Amino acid sequence: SQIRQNYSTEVEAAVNRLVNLYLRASYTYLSLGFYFDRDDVALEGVCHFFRELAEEKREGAERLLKMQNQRGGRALFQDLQKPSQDEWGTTLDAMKAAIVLEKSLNQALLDLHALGSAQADPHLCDFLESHFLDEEVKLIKKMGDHLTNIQRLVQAGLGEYLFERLTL
Amino acid sequence: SQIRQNYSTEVEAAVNRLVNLYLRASYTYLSLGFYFDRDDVALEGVCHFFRELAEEKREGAERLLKMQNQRGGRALFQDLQKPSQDEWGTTLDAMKAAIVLEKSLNQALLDLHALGSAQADPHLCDFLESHFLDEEVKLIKKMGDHLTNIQRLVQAGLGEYLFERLTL
Amino acid sequence: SQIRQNYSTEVEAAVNRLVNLYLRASYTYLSLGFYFDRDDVALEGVCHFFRELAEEKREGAERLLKMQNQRGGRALFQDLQKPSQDEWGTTLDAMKAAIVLEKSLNQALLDLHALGSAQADPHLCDFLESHFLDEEVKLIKKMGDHLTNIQRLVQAGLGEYLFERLTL
Amino acid sequence: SQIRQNYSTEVEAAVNRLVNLYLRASYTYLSLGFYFDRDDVALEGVCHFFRELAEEKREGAERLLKMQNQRGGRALFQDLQKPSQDEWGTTLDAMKAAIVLEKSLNQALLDLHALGSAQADPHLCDFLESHFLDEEVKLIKKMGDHLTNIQRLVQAGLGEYLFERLTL
Amino acid sequence: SQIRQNYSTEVEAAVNRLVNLYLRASYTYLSLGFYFDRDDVALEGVCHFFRELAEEKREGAERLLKMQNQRGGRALFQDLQKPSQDEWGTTLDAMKAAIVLEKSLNQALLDLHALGSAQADPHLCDFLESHFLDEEVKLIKKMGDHLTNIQRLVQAGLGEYLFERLTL
Ligand SMILES: CCCCCCCCCCCCOS(=O)(=O)O
Ligand SMILES: CCCCCCCCCCCCOS(=O)(=O)O
Numbered sequence: 025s026q027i028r029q030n031y032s033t034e035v036e037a038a039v040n041r042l043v044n045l046y047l048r049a050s051y052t053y054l055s056l057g058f059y060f061d062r063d064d065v066a067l068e069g070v071c072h073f074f075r076e077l078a079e080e081k082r083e084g085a086e087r088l089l090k091m092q093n094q095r096g097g098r099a100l101f102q103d104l105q106k107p108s109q110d111e112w113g114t115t116l117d118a119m120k121a122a123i124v125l126e127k128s129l130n131q132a133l134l135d136l137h138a139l140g141s142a143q144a145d146p147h148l149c150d151f152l153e154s155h156f157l158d159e160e161v162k163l164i165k166k167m168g169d170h171l172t173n174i175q176r177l178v179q180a181g182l183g184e185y186l187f188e189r190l191t192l
Numbered sequence: 193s194q195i196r197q198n199y200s201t202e203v204e205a206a207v208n209r210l211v212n213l214y215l216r217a218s219y220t221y222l223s224l225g226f227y228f229d230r231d232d233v234a235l236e237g238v239c240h241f242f243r244e245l246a247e248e249k250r251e252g253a254e255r256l257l258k259m260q261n262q263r264g265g266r267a268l269f270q271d272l273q274k275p276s277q278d279e280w281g282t283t284l285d286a287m288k289a290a291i292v293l294e295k296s297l298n299q300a301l302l303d304l305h306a307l308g309s310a311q312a313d314p315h316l317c318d319f320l321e322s323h324f325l326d327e328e329v330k331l332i333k334k335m336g337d338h339l340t341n342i343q344r345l346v347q348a349g350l351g352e353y354l355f356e357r358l359t360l
Numbered sequence: 361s362q363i364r365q366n367y368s369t370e371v372e373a374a375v376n377r378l379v380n381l382y383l384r385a386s387y388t389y390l391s392l393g394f395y396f397d398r399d400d401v402a403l404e405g406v407c408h409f410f411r412e413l414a415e416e417k418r419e420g421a422e423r424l425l426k427m428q429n430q431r432g433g434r435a436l437f438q439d440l441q442k443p444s445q446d447e448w449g450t451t452l453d454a455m456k457a458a459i460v461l462e463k464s465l466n467q468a469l470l471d472l473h474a475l476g477s478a479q480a481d482p483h484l485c486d487f488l489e490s491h492f493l494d495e496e497v498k499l500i501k502k503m504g505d506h507l508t509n510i511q512r513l514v515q516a517g518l519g520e521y522l523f524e525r526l527t528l
Numbered sequence: 529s530q531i532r533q534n535y536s537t538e539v540e541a542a543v544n545r546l547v548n549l550y551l552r553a554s555y556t557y558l559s560l561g562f563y564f565d566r567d568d569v570a571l572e573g574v575c576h577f578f579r580e581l582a583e584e585k586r587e588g589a590e591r592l593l594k595m596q597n598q599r600g601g602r603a604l605f606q607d608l609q610k611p612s613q614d615e616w617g618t619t620l621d622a623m624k625a626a627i628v629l630e631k632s633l634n635q636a637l638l639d640l641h642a643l644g645s646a647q648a649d650p651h652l653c654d655f656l657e658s659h660f661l662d663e664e665v666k667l668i669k670k671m672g673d674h675l676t677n678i679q680r681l682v683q684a685g686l687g688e689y690l691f692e693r694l695t696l
Numbered sequence: 697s698q699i700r701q702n703y704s705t706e707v708e709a710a711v712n713r714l715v716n717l718y719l720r721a722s723y724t725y726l727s728l729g730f731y732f733d734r735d736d737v738a739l740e741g742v743c744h745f746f747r748e749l750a751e752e753k754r755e756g757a758e759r760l761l762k763m764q765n766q767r768g769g770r771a772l773f774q775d776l777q778k779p780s781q782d783e784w785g786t787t788l789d790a791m792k793a794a795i796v797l798e799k800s801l802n803q804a805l806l807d808l809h810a811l812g813s814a815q816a817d818p819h820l821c822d823f824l825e826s827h828f829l830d831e832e833v834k835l836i837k838k839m840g841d842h843l844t845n846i847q848r849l850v851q852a853g854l855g856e857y858l859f860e861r862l863t864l
């Protein structure tokens with residue numbers, strides 16, 4: 025590419041894998057969101073929480089794709105695997121699966137940052153710090169808070185209703 | 193009628209029966225609404241939920257009556273039977289009876305649509321789709337959601353209070 | 361009822377009968393209104409006059425139902441008989457039937473007031489005076505005025521058109 | 529056509545015929561409108577009623593033409609026959625001829641819908657329901673109302689003046 | 697008195713007794729209100745509910761006093777006995793005592809009305825109907841509603857908190 029400068033093939037490839045990870049995450053949240061929209065689950069605040077995360081993850085993928093092009097790398101898309109579950113259980117189960125998901129994304133961001141540092145790619149480092157690293161830390165903190173409040177509330181049916189009504 | 197065109201006697205008659213069904217439903221909701229207004233029941237959000245439905249059902253009847261005249265059919269009114277109950281029990285009992293009621297209305301709409309299709313009456317089909325079919329589906333979904341949340345909340349007294357306060 | 365005070369069973373029952381009378385009246389006006397909406401009758405001002413009365417009568421029933429609950433009485437609904445006619449003839453015929461109807465309602469209000477006085481129920485008396493007695497007197501006066509103008513106008517077709525156009 | 533999908537030659541041709549019918553109708557209303565503008569007829573409200581219908585019918589033709597192109601069909605125009613009359617008599621005569629005209633259009637819409645259903649063309653069905661079927665039913669109802677009021681008014685000269693002044 | 701007309705000594709005296717009853721009631725509500733303001737009770741919504749009633753009852757006394765002067769009667773004040781309790785227990789206990797109190801006031805209003813009717817004093821009757829009778833009925837209905845919801849909520853501590861938070 026006429027514009028490519030200091031952009032390793034290793035980072036280029038890892039960025040493509042990270043796009044797949046973010047779209048997979050977006051797909052997982054779409055599934056979570058619509059599960060809580062079922063008439064036999066019916067937790068609107070939980071549905072909205074997860075639908076908003078689906079959107080955030082899709083936007084993360086787009087930011088990575090934009091950056092890939094800015095650096096002269098080439099987007100390569102792969103199949104997107106379906107989410108790990110068809111049904112997501114309680115709000116507690118769902119929030120637990122979500123924090124596991126976010127931790128996996130965070131670890132992928134950290135690995136990518138380590139790769140960038142090894143490749144001496146300061147633009148990539150800045151990119152990850154500016155748009156991802158603190159976003160993830162904040163989100164994981166929030167999910168941790170939610171998990172603590174959910175568990176505090178487990179009269180489990182009553183607790184699930186109240187959390188959705190008064191927190192989400 | 194000078195204006196009547198492609199409007200079968202079968203549809204005309206079924207429309208009159210459907211008006212009776214909708215007014216009966218409106219009457220049932222009036223009864224439900226005032227039951228929850230009793231000093232010994234006292235659930236204002238439940239009262240309002242049912243009173244609003246009484247109004248919706250009456251408006252459905254008026255829309256059918258207007259349409260009947262538009263097609264050159266003739267409104268024929270019949271006695272309106274009183275609701276199936278004098279007292280409606282808990283919010284749960286009431287919501288259960290309401291979803292049964294809505295399903296019966298929905299089935300009547302579906303039968304009328306099938307009749308219209310058999311009579312090749314596309315204006316009637318459009319009329320039912322535009323003003324009734326999706327309305328019913330949405331309402332039944334909402335009642336299903338409510339039922340799930342109500343059952344989740346059954347400390348039954350506490351649950352009934354909280355649902356009325358925080359959902360209705 | 362924990363709140364019931366100075367509210368006789370006789371008044372409670374008569375209030376329930378009066379609700380039935382008001383809903384019957386509302387039903388009668390719904391029928392009148394849609395009759396004048398027929399393409400072969402087509403008197404929009406007459407249709408609107410009666411449709412508005414249907415609404416007023418329904419609201420009267422709701423006021424009675426609200427009052428019943430306020431006093432600790434219990435609403436009991438009964439079958440609603442269909443209106444006395446399927447077709448209502450001329451504006452004159454219709455207005456004549458309407459004033460007969462209103463007189464019957466007025467007489468029921470007067471009987472209820474007499475019952476309340478015999479039961480020494482001053483809250484009921486105030487209720488009837490504030491919300492019904494003068495309303496009826498005013499409405500009956502208006503119908504009387506209309507009847508006089510209608511009869512004055514009977515070239516009967518011309519007269520019916522002009523009354524609907526210039527008065528209603 | 530590169531875009532044509534599920535659009536039968538039968539429907540394409542019937543749509544072209546329907547365009548001819550709508551333009552013919554527009555032409556008929558133009559003639560009616562200007563007849564009532566004659567100094568020896570002079571009924572401005574009748575003139576305006578028919579001129580507005582001429583415009584509506586032309587717009588119907590344009591909607592059909594637009595739809596034809598959207599589906600990849602090809603507009604084919606044919607000669608437009610002149611209206612059935614040069615002079616249109618009374619408002620009554622004119623309104624009678626208009627309702628006959630609208631019924632013929634309505635029947636053509638119904639036939640086209642039946643053709644679409646036989647050809648399993650759901651886009652065409654939606655198109656007819658959304659833009660034509662209820663429009664026709666409403667218009668025919670209105671003309672029926674007018675006819676009833678006109679006939680009620682037949683002192684025929686006086687009646688024709690009053691209808692034009694107070695209704696149109 | 698130069699203005700006194702149709703105002704019996706019996707009514708005059710009963711009006712003075714009723715003023716004492718209303719001020720006693722105001723005093724009782726002042727006590728209730730400040731009890732719920734105690735640091736070891738601490739239910740702000742209950743405190744406010746009763747403090748507002750103290751004000752309403754004082755205003756009732758002033759209206760009676762104004763009316764007494766309007767009729768040419770003479771205000772005579774008597775000692776005001778302290779409330780029946782120093783401490784008022786739970787919200788439930790308090791609301792129960794309040795409805796007993798309101799019923800006693802209502803009965804006094806009814807007795808006064810009966811006296812007025814026996815004395816053929818229509819101004820007094822109008823006065824009681826306009827300013828007191830429906831006010832009492834409404835208040836008693838509300839207290840009945842509250843009692844039902846309170847009892848529904850009795851985890852008694854949790855229930856008392858939730859009622860104060862979500863209803864009062
Ligand atoms: C325009 C009034 C027509 C009423 C027709 C009479 C049927 C009564 C059915 C109950 C209506 C209950 O309606 S509601 O508005 O009170 O909920
Ligand atoms: C955009 C014009 C297309 C006209 C097509 C020519 C057909 C003429 C039919 C009369 C139109 C009468 O139309 S009107 O507007 O005068 O009432």
